[PDB]
């Protein structure tokens, strides 16, 4: 399955996606309105639905091909809507209790990331939460080599098909990651009153900002 390959490619998948679901559930009500930016096949959205059966999910992505898989995943779910939109396009009108994203925002230029965080806060209710599960750069080129070693170590320990890891490395060449503490400070710059790294496995981290808390 697609879901098994993602666990193979992503170190501490269960910790990082689990941490995103847990922090949302401890920050918003059961009936929360949640925006999922770069939802893809809707993997984080599925994890949220499992925890929050009464939550309204809006799944957003630039790729109709990716959303086709999200449509199938959520075939019979009447509290899930799907919007075709770029992160750089106007966000859907607030208010949202939570805006979430997994492995998407790293594709934007740094200035576009900072602008996006500001635009996200504007569509969040007071006390609202932004959560990102993100590929993060090491703070030095030497530590980046160690980050890469640990990613490789997980992929080989997971018995990952060679051709799928090759495709994975190729996709990462088109990412523009930065270190977690830099993008956490960008949340503070954007006007989020608290921001924190909840969980981290070297190259992959779950962080959140709160709009008043
Ligand atoms: N500028 C942009 N605007 C919207 N979606 C974007 C984007 N750049 C990349 N994406 C989307 O971001 C996704 C990255 S793959 C991650 C998919 C899913 N969130 C998961 O965790 O499994 C892809 O679906 C890609 O189409």
Per-residue DSSP letters for 75-104? TT-TTEEEEE--TTSPPPPS-EEEEEEES-
As for ligand 1, residues whose beta carbon falls within 6 Å of it are 6, 38-41, 43-44, 61-63, 66, 86-88, 102-104, 107
Ligand 1 pocket test, pick from 20, 38, 113 with the greatest ligand atom count within 8 Å of Cβ, gives 38
- Alpha carbon distance 84, 197 (integer Å): 29
| Contacts of 156 by beta carbon, 8 Å cutoff, 6+ apart | none
CA-nearest residue, atom 6 of ligand 1: 38
Residue 43 burial (10 A CB sphere; 0-12, 13-18, 19+): buried
Give the three-state DSSP class for 57. Answer: strand
Resolution to 1 decimal place, in Å: 1.9
Q: Which ranges in the chain belong to alpha helices (H)?
A: 2-9, 13-25, 43-51, 64-73, 110-122, 141-157, 162-172, 180-189
Task: Using most ligand atoms within 8 A of CB, pick from 104, 109, 132 the residue to mutate for ligand 1.
Answer: 104
CA distance 18 to 40: 18
CA atoms within 13 A on the CB side of 72: 9
Q: What are phi and psi of 37, to 5 degrees?
A: -85, 130
What φ, ψ does residue 74 adopt, rounded to 5°? -115, 30
Q: Is 191 helix (H, G, I), strand (E, B) or coil?
A: coil
Tokens 């059966």 map to which residue? 53
User: Which atom of ligand 1 is nearest the CA belonging to 89?
Assistant: 3
The tokens describing 126, both together, are 């007071």
Pairing of strands 204-210, 194-201: antiparallel
Q: How far is the CA of 103 from the centre of ligand 1 (A)?
A: 7
List the domains of the chain with CATH numbers.
2-210 (3.40.50.150)
Residue 30 C-alpha to ligand 1 middle, in angstroms?
26
Residue owning the nearest CA to atom 23 of ligand 1: 40
Check if the beta carbon of residue 208 is closer than 8 Å to that of residue 131.
yes
CA-nearest residue for atom 16, ligand 1, is 103
* Count of all residues that appear for the chain in the document: 213
Experimental technique: X-ray
Nearest alpha-carbon partner for 210 in 198, 194, 197: 194
- Asked if residue 146 lies in contact with residue 138, where contact means CB atoms within 8 angstroms, the answer is yes
Nearest CA to ligand 1 atom 24: 40
> Distance between CA 50 and CA 3 in Å, rounded?
15
């Amino acid at each position: 399955t697609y879901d098994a390959l993602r666990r193979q490619l992503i170190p501490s998948f269960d910790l990082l996606y689990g941490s995103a679901v847990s922090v949302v559930a401890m920050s918003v009500p059961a009936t929360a309105r949640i925006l999922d930016l770069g939802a893809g096949t809707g993997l984080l959205g599925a994890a949220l639905r499992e925890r929050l059966p009464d939550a309204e999910l809006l799944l957003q992505d630039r790729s109709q091909a990716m959303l086709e898989q999200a449509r199938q995943r959520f075939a019979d779910d009447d509290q899930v809507a799907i919007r075709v939109a770029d992160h750089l396009d106007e966000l859907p009108a607030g208010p949202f209790d939570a805006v979430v994203s997994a492995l998407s925002i790293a594709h934007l230029e740094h200035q576009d990331k900072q602008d996006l965080f500001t635009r996200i806060r504007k569509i969040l209710r007071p006390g609202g939460i932004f959560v990102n599960v993100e590929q993060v750069l090491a703070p030095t080129s030497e530590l980046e080599k160690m980050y890469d070693r640990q990613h490789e170590a997980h992929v080989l320990a997971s018995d990952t098909p060679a051709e799928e890891w090759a495709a994975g490395r190729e996709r990462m060449k088109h990412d523009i990651p930065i270190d977690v503490e830099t993008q956490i400070q960008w949340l503070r710059d954007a006007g989020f009153t608290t921001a924190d790294c909840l969980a981290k496995d070297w190259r992959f981290a779950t962080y959140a900002g709160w709009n008043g808390s």
